[PDB]
Write a protein that binds this ligand. Structure first.
Ligand code: ATP
Ligand code: ATP
Ligand code: MG
Ligand code: MG
Ligand code: NA
Ligand code: NA
Lengths: 305, 305
């Protein structure tokens, strides 16, 4: 049994954070325990939203209960979006402790900080978080999944090309994580302008390095939860395929493809044909993608670099 | 799309409340939205447990969020263990409005009040809840899943034989729900002393327009151990299987009870292997019962009443 302590948001309607991470990991047989960092009616991409958060003391309270029963032994830890600096610090103390309890623990960190829209990036988290991430979180992380913007912020240098991107990943590797994966980038593709690029690098002794590239066909709308889903599925596939970033990223990415495909279709069907689908209609068709998650048909071959 | 609003407990580790009802319903294709009434480290049957609870005001706020985004359109509402009277009264108003929004909404209500342990029964929620359930909840419920003790508290009648059970079930129908299932009772079993009894009663109008009633009975072999979350699982699967077989209580129940069996069988084996088994080893082996949840092999046929 593989246990995962996943600490992320919970929303009542929709799929983001733990909602996007849990089902798929459960479907793939993991014992994922979800610590809901917040509980909102839905994600902030909607016009409205209400909810309550979980403060650092409550997080600790929860960990203590787990400790008391000797349930503080996990195989992986998964974290994503957080707005509170106090919360992040508490998360760090927990991974450290869980790591002492089980040194083999793999910490999967999604350093959610911001994104680039047109080519300009803007953080959607307070700045005081960046240093914590650079100095406390990443060093403890074994696997990190930043998008292009987050990889830039974390290293201090802009990524203009693929080679610059790979240099930035090298920097992150030295910061601690043995597995780095850029989940999206403005990088150009020879396949056309309708593409976003994914880059992945893994450091594993034998020391041997593995680097892969993937050119994903862009879809018309804006999704929410896909980053979180990418992180959880990476966790899942690097677990079944350790020492194979290639396949692990192919299954991860193929899973997302199917899900988004199913989502964009039903989304356009509901929305009046010719009309841009709303955030509500654009919620991931998670439940309906069950079979694609269990065994994703590979539809994007990754090229070795 | 079949949308379910499930307001129940959440735990980090283990499967009870919403943790026991979500994965299975998701596996079965339902868009189940979970509103976590509490967030504990684990269920209260463990030596220890820490956590926070959701109070009526925050529930209302969470509801407000859905409302503002016009996402308060559900096909089913599902509730279970509720600890606070003002919360239950909030759950009641919520359901009342969801029903105004969609008259076809089916409220599946598991009236958690207590259970028989010795030969005696005792409550495990504030006694000032009983009147609320009697006067506000049950009247709104369409499907209720009380155990024997609860069917007695709601009816103000004690059940000593199969016939008093049926009499009580009729009383329960007159209070509101068209479907009443007694999820466990001591009652005599032609197959021995180690058998708990399940009783089902469903009233419905058939095509012609005649109001009829289906009655079933099931004798389950008692296993030597205490499980937590199985009541929640029973209700969850009841919802799901009466949804597929609306005019057939026999099949819905046989499938519901059969799933519990499979889950319980697999759970007891991995418990004996690890051990008496503590609460932790008797945690329902949920993720591992995926197949059985999807297509449960009927292993206990119901006798018709
Ligand atoms: N518009 C899209 N078209 C095609 N694929 C997409 C699209 N949006 C997201 N994806 C899929 O989701 C993956 C992650 O991209 P996304 O932008 O959602 O997350 P991110 O910004 O990289 O990370 P995060 O949101 O956690 O900071 C992409 O690699 C791709 O597989
Ligand atoms: N010890 C057991 N042996 C066999 N089956 C069991 C056992 N415990 C629970 N079950 C299964 O779970 C079902 C519900 O029983 P359980 O006692 O868990 O809930 P309940 O007491 O009837 O209702 P609630 O717990 O919600 O108040 C039983 O009908 C049976 O299908
Ligand atoms: Mg992005
Ligand atoms: Mg019981
Ligand atoms: Na990312
Ligand atoms: Na019950």
């Amino acid at each position: 049994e593989c246990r995962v302590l996943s600490i992320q948001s919970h929303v009542i309607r929709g799929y983001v954070g733990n909602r996007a991470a849990t089902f798929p990991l459960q479907v793939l047989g993991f014992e994922i325990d979800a610590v809901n960092s917040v509980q909102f009616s839905n994600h902030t991409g909607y016009a409205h939203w209400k909810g309550q958060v979980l403060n650092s003391d409550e997080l600790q309270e929860l960990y203590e209960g787990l400790r008391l029963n000797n349930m503080n032994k996990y195989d992986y830890v998964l974290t994503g979006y957080t707005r509170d600096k106090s919360f992040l610090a508490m998360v760090v103390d927990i991974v450290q402790e869980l790591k002492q309890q089980n040194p083999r623990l793999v910490y999967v960190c999604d350093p959610v900080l911001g994104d680039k829209w047109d080519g300009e990036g803007s953080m959607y988290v307070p700045e005081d978080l960046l240093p914590v991430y650079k100095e406390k979180v990443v060093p403890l992380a074994d696997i990190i999944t930043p998008n292009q913007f987050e990889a830039e912020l974390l290293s201090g240098r802009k990524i203009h090309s693929q080679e610059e991107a790979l240099r930035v990943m090298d920097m992150l590797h030295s910061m601690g994580p043995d597995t780095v994966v850029i989940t999206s980038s403005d990088l150009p593709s020879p396949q056309g302008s309708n593409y976003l690029i994914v880059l992945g690098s893994q450091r594993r002794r034998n020391v041997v390095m593995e680097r892969i590239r993937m050119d994903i066909r862009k879809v018309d709308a804006v999704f929410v939860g896909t980053g979180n889903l990418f992180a959880a599925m990476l966790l899942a596939w690097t677990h079944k395929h350790p020492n194979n970033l290639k396949v692990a990223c192919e299954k991860t990415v193929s899973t997302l493809h199917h899900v988004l495909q199913r989502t964009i279709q039903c989304a356009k069907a509901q929305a009046g044909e010719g009309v841009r689908p709303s955030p509500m209609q654009l919620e991931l068709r998670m439940v309906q993608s069950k079979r694609d998650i269990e065994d994703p048909e590979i539809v994007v071959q990754a090229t070795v670099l």
